[PDB]
Amino acid sequence: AMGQTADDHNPKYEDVDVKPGETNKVTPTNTDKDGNPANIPDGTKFEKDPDAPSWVEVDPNTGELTVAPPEGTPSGGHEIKVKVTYPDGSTDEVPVTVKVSDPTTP
């Protein structure tokens, strides 16, 4: 079998909308080359882009995203990246859209 594990997986994160002082958690979903749900391979590792906000964290083993903007964080949108490394050393860059909403009043 030729190719890379990355060719057979398509991790995805739902959009995040979070107010200052909230904590939201997002589990990546995943589909195969045919578009059908599939589990991410065990041993896959996850790392946020080092330029991502300090208040976005990515579980290194599971890829779960914890988004916890402090009080005082400005409202606004962010387009961030998570690097996925499969156990064969292949990689994917996976985006997440993170909106910080106003604390009280949209």
UniProtKB/TrEMBL annotation:
<feature type="region of interest" description="Disordered">
    <location>
        <begin position="3"/>
        <end position="106"/>
    </location>
</feature>
<feature type="domain" description="Long Rib">
    <location>
        <begin position="6"/>
        <end position="101"/>
    </location>
</feature>
<protein>
    <submittedName>
        <fullName>Surface protein</fullName>
    </submittedName>
</protein>
<feature type="compositionally biased region" description="Basic and acidic residues">
    <location>
        <begin position="6"/>
        <end position="22"/>
    </location>
</feature>
